[PDB]
Amino acid sequence: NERLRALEDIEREIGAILQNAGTAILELSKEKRLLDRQAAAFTTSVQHVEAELSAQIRYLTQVATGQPHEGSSYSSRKDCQMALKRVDYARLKISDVARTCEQML
Amino acid sequence: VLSIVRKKFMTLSPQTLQLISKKKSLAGAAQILLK
Numbered sequence: 001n002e003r004l005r006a007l008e009d010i011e012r013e014i015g016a017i018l019q020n021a022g023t024a025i026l027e028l029s030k031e032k033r034l035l036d037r038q039a040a041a042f043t044t045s046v047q048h049v050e051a052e053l054s055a056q057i058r059y060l061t062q063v064a065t066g067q068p069h070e071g072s073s074y075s076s077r078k079d080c081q082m083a084l085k086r087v088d089y090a091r092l093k094i095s096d097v098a099r100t101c102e103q104m105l
Numbered sequence: 106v107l108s109i110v111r112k113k114f115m116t117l118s119p120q121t122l123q124l125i126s127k128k129k130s131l132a133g134a135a136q137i138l139l140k
Binding site for chain 1: 127128131132134135138139
């Protein structure tokens with residue numbers, strides 16, 4: 001759950017770091033203010049993105065041997081399907097009884 | 106021409122080309138990078 005958001009934020013930060021490095025290079029090579037701080041921030045963000053990528057790659061490696069988490073609660077799915085079918089059949093029978101009663105009265 | 110010379114060889118402005126070319130290439134690369 002949180003690892004997905006972490007990887008998404010890491011990718012967004014890598015993109016932002018690339019953009020900041022490009023902008024800092026442009027501002028520094030245009031003419032010769034904040035170019036030094038911009039380059040420092042860009043280098044720091046690039047290093048942080050690299051560290052985050054290395055940490056995510058150095059994960060616990062849950063299985064890496066076969067198809068893990070086999071069985072997605074299919075029994076519960078089938079039970080819920082049968083319950084819904086029972087409810088639908090009950091509704092149909094109740095509607096039939098109601099039509100019979102309306103024809104009676 | 107160089108291989109032929111390797112036949113008979115013989116010996117016979119504030120433009121600031123590099124200064125302007127550096128900034129020109131910097132802007133050209135920065136444009137594509139920002140894009």
